[PDB]
Design a protein around this ligand. Structure first.
Ligand SMILES: C[C@H]1O[C@H](C)CC(O)(O)O1
Ligand SMILES: C[C@H]1O[C@H](C)CC(O)(O)O1
Ligand SMILES: [Zn+2]
Ligand SMILES: [Zn+2]
Ligand SMILES: [Zn+2]
Ligand SMILES: [Zn+2]
Lengths: 340, 327
């Protein structure tokens, strides 16, 4: 009964305020409006044409995803990935797509973050969840962390601060990995040493690897498996070294068949799916957004328009795919009880 | 005849006593807006900076050059607020310092030139405030990216006439490589201040650069961890050379004939998030005068050493005006 009720119930924080779990609907759990650096969009909007051009591009892309069935995206851009929650709020209002914002730290923390203690980082993550991001009053609904191989000492502090902020607030944790180095195993160990439940943790970029034994072992432990870069592929771009390095030479079909593989092995309840798409991208080579748009014009609509029909004709039931894209994110994003 | 400040253009005569290398807040891009509680609050940081700049004003300072770049967390709206409430002119900087994020590190020399030009010719962010100086940095031999920054800085200077000021590891003679790259872009040494030059005792390094026409930034005079020997992080940052040793380098360059090429400053801050947490309190504990240290302590020290008042006025008024005036 309660799956049909939207006018009441517990709530998820978005850039427009709280929404009921029922209102979240079809949710992409790992996306970006703009992948940049702190302060960069405000200091150099002409890099993106203009701020107005970036807004219009993102609103059009979100409307395309909405027409394909998407109702919510989780923008997992952190402070150091150039998250501008005022941009997120504007595009969310114009496109009528819910956007959950993130705290945490990604791969490019400045000195003012890298010098901080685990206790200090915990306070910063709590600030963005409990008080608001900058002076906007927009509260983060997820904590994003990253490793690229064995964690640096600072990344260990970030992982522990994320776990502590998660336990204190009930909001979940989502991660960036070098999946080929099995990063999720060390991340899980650090999280478990802090007492975090695996059901509150998504191990991301997990479709970057073909090692099913690594994925199934984490899923068996209760971790959520983020198969979040399905359209990332440089097939056809083999002469472009920067695009090939970023997007890989594995096909979207290969990535999508990892979804089916985990389903077939009984782990559908542990899967989250996304595009890891962007509408602007300044933290890499200059032409990269144009290159990416050239091989995936559907943008964030790729999951509903391409991956769902592909898996359905492979025999995955529609209700299973709805469970992965609607119910699984709702359980993940719903805040659990705070500790104590 | 005009210099851009955070309150708009001023004439050269209005700059007066100028501190050429200072910071309202040494931070990181976006950090002051995302975590103002690190500084107590934004309001507390404003009040502290206004109290400190008012003290420097009472000691005779009329202008400071805030050489915080984008990646040092420059917030020009903060600079404007503090400048207005302390009635001290503040010149803002473009360029890049020692902590550029990916969105900067991945850019070409052409792209960096466009960004520096934007901040000088159009404005910083959406504020309309235009930079009056370009700040660059090396820490020993330049990285490939720092070479691009130095070249883009030279190109932006040649297009606008605003000068270039540098951060160096003086002990590794970085001013020589900076000079070489600047001259390979056709930049005139008289448009360049080689900063942190008081961090070294090698007078022959400094006089050779000045004999080539460079301005010499003796800009960290109160930086000293004397008395803080049990503090490893403060000692590493501030050094164990005394302020008197640094100040006597001013006299030495005057005595060697370079008074017209010396720029003096404190390299002080009112907030500081890019190092260890307690560093601002530690620094305030040994230099409560803050930015007033140059006028209150260094000027009388040099006067009693025999430096004429006209020479000290030339260093603190004439040289910054000549340096900051766009060519
Ligand atoms: C900023 C964004 O760009 C990449 C495509 C992937 C990421 O998720 O690591 O972050
Ligand atoms: C004092 C110390 O922090 C400042 C932000 C910059 C510096 O490089 O001048 O050194
Ligand atoms: Zn990532
Ligand atoms: Zn991502
Ligand atoms: Zn410096
Ligand atoms: Zn400085």
């Amino acid at each position: 009964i309660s799956e049909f009720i939207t006018n009441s119930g517990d709530r998820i924080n978005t850039v427009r305020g709280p929404i009921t779990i029922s209102e979240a609907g079809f949710t992409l759990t790992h996306e970006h409006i703009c992948g940049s650096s702190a302060g960069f969009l405000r200091a150099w909007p002409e890099f993106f044409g203009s701020r107005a051009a970036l807004v219009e591009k993102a609103v059009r892309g979100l409307r395309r995803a909405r027409a394909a069935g998407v109702r919510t995206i989780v923008d997992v851009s952190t402070f150091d990935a150039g998250r501008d929650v005022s941009l997120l709020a504007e595009v969310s209002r114009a496109a009528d797509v819910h956007i959950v914002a993130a705290t945490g730290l990604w791969e490019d923390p400045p000195l003012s973050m890298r010098l901080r203690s685990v206790e200090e980082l915990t306070q910063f993550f709590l600030r963005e969840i409990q008080y608001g991001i900058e002076d906007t009053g927009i509260r983060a609904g997820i904590i994003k962390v990253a490793t690229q191989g064995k964690a640096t000492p600072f990344q260990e502090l970030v992982l522990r601060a994320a776990a502590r902020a998660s336990l204190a607030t009930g909001v979940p944790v989502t991660t960036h990995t070098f999946a080929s180095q099995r990063d999720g195993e060390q991340q899980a160990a650090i999280f478990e040493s802090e007492g975090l439940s695996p059901s509150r943790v998504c191990i991301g970029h997990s479709d970057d690897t073909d090692d099913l034994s690594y994925l199934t072992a984490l899923a068996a432990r209760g971790y959520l498996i983020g198969l979040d870069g399905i359209p990332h592929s440089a097939i056809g771009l083999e002469d472009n070294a920067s695009a090939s390095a970023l997007l890989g030479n594995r096909s979207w079909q290969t990535r999508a068949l990892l979804i089916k593989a985990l389903i077939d092995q009984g782990y559908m309840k542990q899967i989250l799916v996304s595009n890891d798409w962007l509408f602007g991208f300044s933290s890499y080579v200059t032409n990269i957004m144009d290159v990416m748009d050239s091989v995936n014009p559907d943008g964030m609509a790729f999951i509903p328009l391409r991956v769902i029909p592909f898996l359905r004709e492979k025999g995955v039931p529609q209700e299973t795919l709805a469970g992965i894209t609607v119910t699984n994110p709702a359980r993940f994003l719903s805040p659990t009880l705070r500790a104590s």
